[PDB]
Amino acid sequence: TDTTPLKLSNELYAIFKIHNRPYLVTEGDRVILPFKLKQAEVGDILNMTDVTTLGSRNYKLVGHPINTSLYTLKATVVGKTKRAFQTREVTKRRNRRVRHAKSKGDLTILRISELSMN
Amino acid sequence: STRPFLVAPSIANSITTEAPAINHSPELANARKW
Amino acid sequence: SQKIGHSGLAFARLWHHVDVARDKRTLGRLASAIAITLIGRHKPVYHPSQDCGDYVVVTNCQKIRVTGKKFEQKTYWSHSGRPGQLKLQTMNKVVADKGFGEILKKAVSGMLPKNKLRKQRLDRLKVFDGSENPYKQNITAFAHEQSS
Amino acid sequence: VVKAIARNSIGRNGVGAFVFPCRKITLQFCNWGGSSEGMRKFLTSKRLDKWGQEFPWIQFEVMRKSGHPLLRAEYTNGREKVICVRNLNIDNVENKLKLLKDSDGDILRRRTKNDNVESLNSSVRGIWSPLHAAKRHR
Amino acid sequence: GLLWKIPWRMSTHQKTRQRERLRNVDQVIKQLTLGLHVQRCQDKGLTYQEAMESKKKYKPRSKSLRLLNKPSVFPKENQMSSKDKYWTFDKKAVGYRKGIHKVPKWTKISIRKAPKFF
Amino acid sequence: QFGFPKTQVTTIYNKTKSASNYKGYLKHRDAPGMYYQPSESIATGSVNSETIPRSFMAASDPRRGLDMPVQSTKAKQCPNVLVGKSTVNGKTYHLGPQEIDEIRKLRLDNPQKYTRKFLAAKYGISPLFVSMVSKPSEQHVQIMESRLQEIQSRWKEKRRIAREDRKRRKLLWYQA
RNA sequence: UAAUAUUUAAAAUCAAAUAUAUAUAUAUUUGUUAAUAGAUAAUAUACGGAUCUUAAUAAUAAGAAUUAUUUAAUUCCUUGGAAUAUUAUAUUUUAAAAUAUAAAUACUGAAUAUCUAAAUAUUAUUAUUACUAAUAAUAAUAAUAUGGUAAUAGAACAUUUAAUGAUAAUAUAUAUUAGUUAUUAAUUAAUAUAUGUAUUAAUUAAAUAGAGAA
């Protein structure tokens, strides 16, 4: 697959999928994953082994896990923090008891450090 | 001494047609009046 | 990332033109089509919290196509608050009074989302029974199309 | 003529090097006070030493104050999380500490549905235009 | 009295869904039979693949399964008539017929064989 | 050149009626390989390499030979917009030094009689050129300034604000 | 083939399909009318509404939004393959023709299921930490479970009093604002007012112990 016009461009985007959730990024972006990572700690680096689509302004390589040979896209883990706390109030319509359903889900923050053709 | 103007093909090729008589036109109303 | 950049052209209101003489869609279908344009659902930058729809100029509305016996039999209604003041007018009657444009407009109004924006969107649609109109100049027109 | 209008660069923490977000952690406790028992135990138990060994880029202060026990933590951005570890036990305190370390200092905030990426890079492809579309509308 | 707005016919979509459901039921039965056959084969002294291949497949002995297999008692969807996919015999209707969709839990209930002349 | 298959940004749903819906796009998946997707967008603020014209690349850059600042429009068809008369019919350097001197003298003498337009008419030459050549009597300039000031004063509140807004807009429109 | 008098049927009959010995026979299964009138009341038309029935000449273009039988391009063989056709794209050749590729997995749709994390309880496996260690605390992995009135069971928090009780105006108490911790609570910072300062932390004991419902 002739991958020269991706090689030559300066701006380039990628659509990698973590657990099938697609995120479309360039280098320098901050991806907020809506879950807590146990594999990676803070400061670790993830090489993305599933990238659906690499694209320039006018050309785009695509494929179900396209070869890791072709590109280098690697993200560093910055933060593991939770999204803000909420108490959604659950109740019926003539019943005095209420069930406070609390929610403070967790986030993993990445930074796309490298995004290049290989 | 021309100006930079364009024109759509849809509006250029549109055959000419006269709008029929509206009853709520002033002219028509005039005719009606006593 | 994708949303960042100069977005001025996206939210530009284009003027579209439909010649009902040269369009073979029957009334209702045409109206429906127009509605989408008015809303701005055709463009990928649409968001429901925003009126971003285009202008539509309809011309030669006298040659609109209506099926069956609807011209005679299809009755438009209007009620004041006052009991006994129900006005029921057949399509033909309405046409005679105001024009085919009115008919079209009504359909479009019916189609459109029922909220604040509605009226604005409706007013965006400009209709003319015959060919001539004051918007001829401002319909969107490309430089490559100028062969004719 | 070309005139320059001033601006400044925006820091992207991880693209070149990666500075570690947490910088100082202050284990605060009290000798007297049952609420501060777990904290005291933690301080005693070589766990702190282990933590230090693990993470040398972050410094551990150990204060003595009369109130409830705390884990005030200080981050690169400037902000400071503070967790009162009232009446917790050793393991829970450790967990709290871990949580503190993991977080970047940034304030908590409600995310909307699917707001994942956060860029300051102009779109690689342009923003759509009606006139430069592949398919014209009607 | 109280308005239960339920139509006397079914929409095309509904009909299609019903058909699909019918097909699925048939398939389940078929699968069961197949399983039984392969078990029999294994008991006799064959491999799985061999069993699958076999020309002379064994009918099921258990009464219920046998009955299900019989198209007289329990028709398959292609066999079944239009008039029986979307209507049931009601003893107290006009035309002695009633849309299946009226039958209480019609999405779960199976009911193919209406009476012969009704 | 490249012989890639080209595609629109496809949706499994109807584009006309539901282009803003992200889900459709996500659902769509295309056969693995390279593709040509022309950007559905103008290249005004952009600095992308696939946006730069071949004439502005150095004679060495491999991108010159490649074909992705496409010349889709053709200059034959497009009307000239807001262009000077010297561009339509080439520039002229007919006017000598003596003539120039004379013009200057005239300007110095009587600006209202011998205004720029008049000068242009006389010597088959641009008003801009005349201006470049010759400064008018400073008194005249002062008078003009005064007049302008007066006009400004005569404005209402709203108009001033509008003017300011316009100015701001103008300023903006050279940023890109 | 005209006129003629009934019937609106797949029972019989014929056709097609499936299962049994099988180019036949046996058994089962499916296939047989449509309009119009009749038609109707009181605040207002009343498919929820717009509206929907298509047409040469011309559209890179509309052709039911009704009723009946279906499909997920159409046809054959046994989920598949093949052919045919269509659309889109690319390349070559003279707006066509040839070659290759792709699409044929319709789609939407729930707080359903899965995935993705988090909590709790139980069952079964672990790992770390600390001298009923067959324990406890925390963390994993797999699984199952977590709507709820009357009702039963278990566990916490606020307030006030009594027993024990360091400490300190850089302290405390209360208040406001902004943070923090899965948050009726507490804590952090700033601010304001007290007060030479806790019945303070914690464990017990108790209660005039928690209020939009008389």
Added chain:
RNA sequence: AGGUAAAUAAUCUAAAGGGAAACAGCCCAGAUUAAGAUAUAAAGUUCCUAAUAAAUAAUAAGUGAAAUAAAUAUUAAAAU
């Protein structure tokens, strides 16, 4: 009879969610807390309103298009 009395099953009572325009009791489905990628249920896919393309027939009444009004009459169509 939205009547009454019992029988069987479900739901409601005590059940939020999707559909049935609105809806206790219908059709699907049981909310520990999120997240939103993939299957989907019942229902739908011109617009309002999330999503659609086909095939063969029939209908010309706006019949009909999520609540089928009877005897009978007229006109046509098939079969004998």
Added chain:
RNA sequence: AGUAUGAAAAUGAUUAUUUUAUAAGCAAUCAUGAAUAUAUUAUAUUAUAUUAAUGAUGUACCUUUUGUAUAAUGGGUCAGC
């Protein structure tokens, strides 16, 4: 009905920020522009806070009931009991 103190609320006037004179319904929640305020790490293409553009969703609460948005019961609001 002790004395001090009192930024407790309901309630009134006023000023500031903001929204509001083509818009219709438990006045919130979610989405989402814009304007303003504060911030001694806004490095910004920054972060929070306030605010009825605009869009979607949304029959008060209790009691009693087979069943209540009900046009069934009860409550003018707040403080104390």
